[PDB]
Paper text:
Host proteases, TMPRSS2 and CTSL/[name] cleave the [name]-[name]-2 spike to play a crucial role in the two alternative pathways of viral entry and are characterized as promising pharmacological targets. The entry of [name]-[name]-2 depends on two distinctive pathways, cell surface entry and endosomal entry, where the transmembrane serine protease, TMPRSS2, and endosomal cysteine proteases cathepsin L/B (CTSL/[name]) cleave the viral spike protein. The crystal structures of TMPRSS2 and CTSL/[name] in complex with the potent inhibitors were determined to reveal their specific mode of interaction.
As a result, two inhibitors, K777 and [name] were identified with an IC50 value of 5.43 and 88.85 nM for CTSL, and 174.30 and 244.26 nM for [name]. Significantly, [name] has been used as a clinical drug to treat Alzheimer’s disease. To explore the inhibition mechanism of K777 and [name], we determined the crystal structures of these compounds bound to human CTSL and [name]. The isobutyl and methylbutyl moieties of [name] contribute to the substantial hydrophobic interactions in the S2 and S3 subsites of CTSL, respectively. Notably, these two hydrophobic binding groups insert into the S2 and S3 subsites of the [name] substrate binding pocket in a different manner. This might be explained by the narrower S2 subsite to accommodate the smaller isobutyl group since Asp160, Met161, Asp162, and Ala214 form a continuous steric hindrance barrier in the CTSL to prevent S2 subsite extension. Aside from this major difference, [name] has an almost identical mode of binding at S1 subsite in both CTSL and [name].
Residue numbers in the entry: 0 to 254
Write the structure that this text describes.
């Protein structure tokens, strides 16, 4: 039944958010970015591309509060999707994009790569929960909220995660970052060297096989000059670094 490879970007070509890589900046907001990225994709999938919006990382990061964790000091993906069912999330694009209700307020930076942006630094301050859209945005903040029908865990099962993506779209997951991951450029990542850096949440949008090695297709939130245009592949089928152990998702409510 399931194909040997699957790429959500190919399945849903009228859903540009599936292709988009974001930048969490110097803020420990991975938990929020994996969530709003996958939610953006799923709203588009759920509406057959009639609604394509960048869901606001700012709104989730700043307005969830203690139930999701501590903002830029880290958080809990399962409760991020729960917040989407309870209070909903407004739209908002990239830093200084002036797109949507609440664009991200934390500037982009260089994540373990060289570039023209400032180097990323340690976990900044969490911005305030501001329940107002940027000036001139036409829907009110309340009216711009997109809600989830539900939020749920996917079991620690390769085939279960594969089926979830195949039917319902990209998911959020999390894994343990070891130092050798930081220099990833291409290929299928397998941890071989380096100490544990901490847990990191990401968006899983497909799977495949490269040179006989099964992999998950993953979007990072470290801008496009990190990794493979902002994406990476990681070993699939052995819960490698915990990649299959903390998968979460949810189905949108119809706006
Ligand atoms: C993730 C991040 O931004 O790292 C990039 C530098 C945040 O630090 C974050 O929210 N991390 C974390 C929750 C904290 C540690 C309470 C998380 O989501 N960990 C995933 C668990 C993993 C070991 C399977």
């Amino acid at each position: 039944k399931l194909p040997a490879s699957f790429d959500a970007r190919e399945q849903w070509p009228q859903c540009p958010t599936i292709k988009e890589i974001r930048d969490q900046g110097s803020c420990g907001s991975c938990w929020a970015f994996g969530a709003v990225e996958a939610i953006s994709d799923r709203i588009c999938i759920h509406t057959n591309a009639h609604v394509s919006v960048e869901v606001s990382a700012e709104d989730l990061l700043t307005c969830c509060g203690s139930m999701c964790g501590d903002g830029c000091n880290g958080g809990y993906p399962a409760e991020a999707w729960n917040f989407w069912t309870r209070k909903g999330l407004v739209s908002g694009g990239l830093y200084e994009s002036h797109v949507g209700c609440r664009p991200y307020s934390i500037p982009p930076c260089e994540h373990h790569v060289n570039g023209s942006r400032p180097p990323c630094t340690g976990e900044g301050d969490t911005p305030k929960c501001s329940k107002i859209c940027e000036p001139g945005y036409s829907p009110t903040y309340k009216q711009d909220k997109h809600y989830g029908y539900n939020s749920y865990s996917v079991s620690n099962s390769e085939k279960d995660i594969m089926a979830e993506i195949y039917k319902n779209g990209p998911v959020e997951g999390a894994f343990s970052v070891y130092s050798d991951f930081l220099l990833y450029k291409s290929g299928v990542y397998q941890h071989v060297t380096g100490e544990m850096m901490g847990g990191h949440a990401i968006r899983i949008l497909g799977w495949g096989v490269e040179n006989g090695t099964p992999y998950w297709l993953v979007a990072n939130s470290w801008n496009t000059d990190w990794g493979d245009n902002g994406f990476f592949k990681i070993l699939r089928g052995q819960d490698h670094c915990g990649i299959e152990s903390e998968v979460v998702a949810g189905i949108p409510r119809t706006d």
